[PDB]
Design a protein around this ligand. Structure first.
Ligand SMILES: [Mg+2]
Length: 285
């Protein structure tokens, strides 16, 4: 049977397909047989697949959980069978998993914030009036917002016009961003905490014809964000590295099964994407 199994969310999103690639490349490069289970957005099938791989005597399991609470009985079953489990992307609650691979969202906010501060100094005359489009219903995006805001203290001439809630839905983000723009004629920049907020902010800037004088910063590349980078009004987009997450997770299983230590948490850095480095991402979109 297979040596390792990766229990995956779906194969529609680029993020998961890149994670698959990273894990499979690392398996092939280390002479290991990895099978990947596409659960097609079905959390029950994730649980059942884990049980199946336990019965098959796999040597290690990777999981990107849909339901971080609902997956735990199956994770615990793997532990009772002495099969190491590494979680990737979604953070599981405390349990017997050997490691968690993922991103530090606060720190990602800090990294694009530091870029923003330098950009303000170099290209915006050392002062900016910022609006934020967040997602109040999102733990992750609230952290992304917090980390960005922390960096801004390094330039007291960056001040906040307002903070609005895009509700993690592109249309609501667009409406919110449009009212943010019309309400604040002095606004010169927008930070968006995730893909729907970023797409909504982009659409608002375009709808208001403000491509020349509002600079947009945010998270999660899309073809639309790339078009904005090429058009000059999307300045920087923070992009996660799921391929490296998959590679790190697989290599960690090799370490564990070899009898060697691995850290309980493996944080994979994100990349700030600008005009300078967007070319390397073009083939993915
Ligand atoms: Mg700089």
């Amino acid at each position: 049977g297979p040596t390792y199994a990766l229990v995956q969310i779906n194969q529609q999103a680029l993020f998961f397909n890149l994670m698959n690639k990273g894990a499979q490349d690392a398996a092939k490069a280390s002479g290991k047989d990895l099978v990947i289970f596409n659960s097609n957005d079905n959390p029950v099938a994730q649980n059942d697949a884990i049980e199946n791989y336990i019965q098959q005597g796999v040597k290690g399991i990777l999981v990107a959980a849909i339901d971080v609470n609902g997956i735990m009985p199956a994770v615990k079953e793997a532990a009772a069978a002495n099969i190491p489990v590494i979680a990737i992307d979604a953070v599981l609650p405390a349990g017997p998993q050997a490691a968690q691979v993922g991103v530090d969202n606060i720190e990602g906010g800090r990294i694009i914030g530091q870029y923003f501060v330098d950009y303000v100094q170099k290209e915006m005359g050392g002062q900016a009036r910022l609006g934020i489009v967040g997602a109040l219903n999102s733990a992750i995006q609230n952290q992304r917002q917090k980390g960005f805001e922390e960096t801004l203290k390094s330039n007291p001439k960056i001040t906040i016009a307002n903070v609005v809630d895009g509700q993690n839905v592109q249309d609501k983000a667009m409406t919110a961003a449009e009212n943010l723009i019309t309400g604040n004629p002095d606004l010169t920049a927008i930070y968006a905490t995730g893909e729907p907020a970023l797409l909504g902010a982009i659409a608002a800037v375009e709808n208001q014809g403000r491509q020349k004088d509002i600079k947009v910063f945010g998270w999660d590349l899309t073809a639309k964000a790339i078009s904005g980078i090429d058009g000059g009004y999307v300045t920087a987009v923070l992009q996660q590295d799921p391929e490296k997450m998959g590679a790190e997770a697989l290599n960690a299983l090799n370490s564990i099964t070899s009898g060697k230590t691995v850290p309980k948490t493996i944080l994979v850095p994100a990349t700030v994407v600008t005009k300078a480095n967007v070319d390397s991402y073009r083939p993915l979109f």
